[PDB]
Structure 1
Amino acid sequence: RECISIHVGQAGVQIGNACWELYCLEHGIQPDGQMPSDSFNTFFSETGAGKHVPRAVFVDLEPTVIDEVRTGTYRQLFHPEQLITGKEDAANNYARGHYTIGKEIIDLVLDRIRKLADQCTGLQGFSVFHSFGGGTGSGFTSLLMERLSVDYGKKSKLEFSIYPAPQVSTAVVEPYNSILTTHTTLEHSDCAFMVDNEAIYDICRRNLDIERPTYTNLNRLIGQIVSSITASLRFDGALNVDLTEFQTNLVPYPRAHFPLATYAPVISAEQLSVAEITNACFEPANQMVKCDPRHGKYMACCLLYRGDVVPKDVNAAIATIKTKRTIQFVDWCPTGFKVGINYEPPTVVPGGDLAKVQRAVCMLSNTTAIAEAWARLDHKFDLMYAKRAFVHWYVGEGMEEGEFSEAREDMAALEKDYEEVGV
């Protein structure tokens, strides 16, 4: 019944905090772990003393970020053995995350995962949170995913990748790191939700009304949308009740397993209808990955409503969009939109710039227009690899230069795989 979450690099770790902050508010769980109040034990385990502990591992090749976890609001929530830190970071280098530094700590990390999996009876699989451009996030994750495909091979693994964006980008080589992990993590991931930090930036500047967003701003918005996807697993809905169903509903091709997530509504803290929010799911401005689905074919599409929702309003709003817009599907797909509803209201953080809304929706749709995002990375990659720029850093940390090309071909092949489906 149980799902294990893993957080790799600052991105994973800090988005993790935002998600487990938000999970504990949605489940009425206290910062100390207590609860004055099952479906939610998919994510949490239980102590003999009435304390509810997350089924989570935090990993970073450097203390600073995870140190703030275990001296913060939720320091008591996690067991200290779950929070793992090295000393030398990967320094924005996939090679160090995967080869040089990652091998020094991979075994300790896999060991601490076994301790959480041993507590579980019918383990489903893994949720994995990590950046693309980060050295740890790219290199170590891809390594950990390889090794989880051995030590737990017969079960699911889901990604929550943070797609890079120059507005918050810390490194020049982030295209490299993105391509390198996506190549080596392609075969080992069953489904993967990309999060373009540019879209999250754009959304927070427009709909949250912030001049220069911070990471807290972006992570909170992101955690809201992650909660919307994992709500089906935490409250026992009708749709997407276990990790296999994500692949069944959204993945009709092992490789092409990258859904576009769209979330409405994002209301500043300074109500809409069911129809209004469902139209916003087909507005590009509210997507998590910047692309144009109008330029692409849908392989599948799920709608996860939560809150004050009448099942008939949904069917009206669906028929509205199925008639009054031209959402092109592939011919070999069930042309019907899958739906599920969870009547509990979207929780926000007390203090949050995001307002409590009466109802909300998160549309998960495996459109071929998301290939546009791969094209933007591949292009940036090509410019730098044309001059072998920054390549010596990678090659000097245990990586063969060939691996660059093998990865790029796998990304070129993936761009062809998206094309042939959509023609």
Structure 2
Amino acid sequence: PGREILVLHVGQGGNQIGYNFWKTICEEHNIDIRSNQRKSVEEDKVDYKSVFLVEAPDGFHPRALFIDLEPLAVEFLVKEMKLGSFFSEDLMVLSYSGAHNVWSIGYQTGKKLIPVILEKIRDTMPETLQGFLIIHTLGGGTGSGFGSLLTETLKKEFPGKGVLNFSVLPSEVNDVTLAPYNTVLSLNHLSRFSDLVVLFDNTALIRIVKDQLNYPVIKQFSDLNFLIGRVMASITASLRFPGPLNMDLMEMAHNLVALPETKFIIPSVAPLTKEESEMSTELDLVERCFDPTHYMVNCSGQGKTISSVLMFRGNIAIENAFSIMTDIKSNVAFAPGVHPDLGLKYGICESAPVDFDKEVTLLSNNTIISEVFNRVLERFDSLFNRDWYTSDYVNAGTSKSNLKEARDNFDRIIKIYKEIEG
């Protein structure tokens, strides 16, 4: 026993993303998400299912909680995707009132559910649990505020366990006008309590789906969220399947987090299709991951990499993975203080993702974070300097002074990344 992870999905986006993640995990372990059983004994591969799956005598269940302050997103998802016996009622922590896109309402209202959540966790969590993943968007009220509260709560209640966030930033034009306040409040909270924050945004996800997968239409968020699920599954693949070089959650965080504050990470994956996986080299895939076309956060350029983690999955030539390292260091811009021999952390797993020959996943700690975050700050200031939209934050326990305090800490983080850039 050991290595187990518990996944908390918070708000509409966090729970919708959870569908794609759990679908991917079940497929990788040849588990039928509808029957809760192995699809077959003969195709049961050597693996470690306990990382994300609880095996009970009746079948497999996700080590997850599905948390929201309104019931519609989760209930509709479970009905449409036929998840009733996998996303079961005993794993749901739902209320009725909603956060109304205000971080402060999500935070305050979520406090009422913390006892129930902690009881569910302490009911079924093994003592050898390595950590928690919190999946949430930053621009709404529940994912942002309740997700922030949960990050704080888990770090306090479970010392020595990793707390990692997979967090969706607002789009280039925000689709929630309150998103700057919610994003600054969330990033401030995660800077204080998360061990590592892996970021995504829908502008980048849409670009990848339209340009790398060439989907003719995106009709549901599943046709975007699958990319987030791919990152989550691939970066944990070496905990779950054999390979030459495995790595756990805090192993990856320790290699990325150069200074305590530099914990905000941009992911990328290559390739995106089976056909590309069968007609590519390790060098080609790594170069794609380091190219802004493949970043899952919308960036103006390659920035400067401080530190990176690369997971190689599938039919990988180890000599190519190693031999290309000097090429990565020569062709990709790293921050000025990074020694020519440093800034890379490798994992290598023999299991390829569904039907692919091979795949590379990159987690990059990149100074371009400062540009992404500066844009959030500029949006925040445009509202705050006019006192726009502050009333419902104030009424839910976030004073205007508190809003400014969060903004100023956010700016301190931006400046640390900018200083490292040079």
Taking structure 1 as the reference length, the TM-score comes to 0.91
Change beyond 3 A, Cα 1:94–1:252: same
Aligned to 2:158: 152
Match of 1:84 among 78, 85, 93: 93
Matches within 5 A, 1:60-79: 60-71=68-79, 72-79=81-88
**SS of alignment partner, residue 293 of structure 2:** helix
In structure 2, give the amino acid aligned to 1:249: N
**Structure 2 CA distance, aligned partners of 1:127 and 1:145?**
9
Shift of 1:326: 4.7
Structure 2 contact 292–302 (Cα < 8 Å) conserved:
no
> What CA distance in whole angstroms lies between the structure 2 residues aligned with 1:386 and 1:212?
39
Name the residue aligned to 1:42: 51
Matched, 1:204 2:209: yes
2:346 is matched with 339
Question: C-alpha root-mean-square deviation of aligned residues, in Å?
Answer: 2.1
1:256 corresponds to which residue? 262
Alignment of 1:168-317 (within 5 A): 169-210=174-215, 212-213=217-218, 214-235=220-241, 237=243, 239=245, 241-267=247-273, 271-274=278-281, 275-292=283-300, 294-296=302-304, 298-317=305-324
Any conservation in 2 of the 1:58–1:83 contact (CA below 8 Å)? Answer: yes
**Equivalent residue of 1:187, what SS?**
helix
Moved more, 5-14 or 247-256: 247-256
Q: Structure 2: any 5+ residue segments left out of the alignment?
A: none
Q: Cα distance, 1:292 vs. partner?
A: 4.7
CA distance in 2, matches of 1:70, 1:3: 22
Q: CA deviation at 1:282?
A: 2.0
**Could you give the per-residue CA deviations for residues 67-125 of structure 1, whole angstroms, max 9, x where no partner exists?**
134434222124421112100110111011012x22222222222222222xx131111
Which amino acid in structure 2 is aligned with residue 416 of structure 1?
K
SS of the residue corresponding to residue 153 of structure 1 reads coil
Aligned residue in 2 for 1:59: 67
Name whichever of 177-186 and 156-165 sits farther off: 177-186
Contact 1:191 1:246 in 2 (8 A): no
Asked if structure 1 preserves the Cα contact closer than 8 Å seen for 2:303 and 2:368, the reply is yes
Q: Distance in 1 between matches of 2:24 and 2:161?
A: 26
Q: 1:303 to 1:42 in 2, by over 3 A?
A: same
Q: Contact 2:190–2:197 at 8 Å: present in 1 too?
A: no
Which aligned pairs between 1:402-417 and structure 2 lie closer than 5 A? 402-417=401-416
1:115 and 2:123 matched = yes
**1:87 maps to amino acid:** Y
Change (3 A) 1:106 1:221: same
Which deviates more from structure 2 when the two are superposed, residues 204-213 or residues 138-147?
Answer: 204-213
Q: How far apart, in 1, do the equivalents of 2:253 and 2:343 lie?
A: 17
State the alpha-carbon separation in 1 of the partners of residues 215 and 168 from structure 2: 21
Shift of 1:173: 0.6
Does the 8 A contact of 1:93 with 1:135 survive in 2?
yes
State the alpha-carbon separation in 1 of the partners of residues 297 and 172 from structure 2. Answer: 14
Secondary structure (helix, strand or coil) at the match of 2:214 reads: coil
Give CA deviations for 1:262-295 in whole Å, capped at 9, x if unaligned.
2111238893222221221221100011225643
Displacement of 1:212: 4.8
Say which SS state the counterpart of residue 253 (structure 1) adopts: coil
TM-score, structure 2 length as denominator?
A: 0.91
Percent identical residues: 33
Q: How many residues align?
A: 408
Query: Structure 1 regions of 5+ residues with no counterpart?
Result: 348-355
State the one-letter code of the partner of 1:177.
N
SS at match of 2:191: coil
Q: Is the 8 A contact 1:39 1:234 kept in 2?
A: yes
Deviation at 1:65, TM superposition (A): 1.6
For residue 185 of structure 2, what is the amino acid of its counterpart? L
Counterpart of 1:137 in 2: which secondary structure? helix
- Select which of 120, 131, 142 maps to 1:125: 131
The offset of 1:258, in angstroms, is: 1.1
Q: Is the 8 A contact 1:307 1:342 kept in 2?
A: yes
* 2:147 alignment partner in structure 1: 141
* One-letter identity of the residue aligned with 1:16: G
Q: Which amino acid aligns with 2:198?
A: F
How far apart in 2 are the matches of 1:239 and 1:403?
A: 45
One-letter identity of the residue aligned with 2:9: H
Question: In 2, Cα distance between the equivalents of 1:179 and 1:338?
Answer: 30
**Superimposed CA distance per residue, residues 145-170 of structure 1 (whole angstroms, 9 cap, x where no aligned partner):** 22212211232100000111156x54
Contact 2:242/2:350, CA 8 A, preserved across alignment: no
Change (3 A) 1:239 1:190: farther
Moved more, 204-213 or 399-408: 204-213
Using the TM superposition, name which of 338-347 and 9-18 deviates more.
338-347
Equivalent pair of 1:293/1:368 in contact (CA under 8 Å): no
Residue of structure 2 in register with 1:33 after alignment:
36
Cα distance between partner residues in 2 of 1:326 and 1:140: 38
- Going from structure 1 to structure 2, the CA distance change for 1:273 and 1:79 (only over 3 Å counts) comes to same
Which one is further off, 24-33 or 299-308? Answer: 299-308
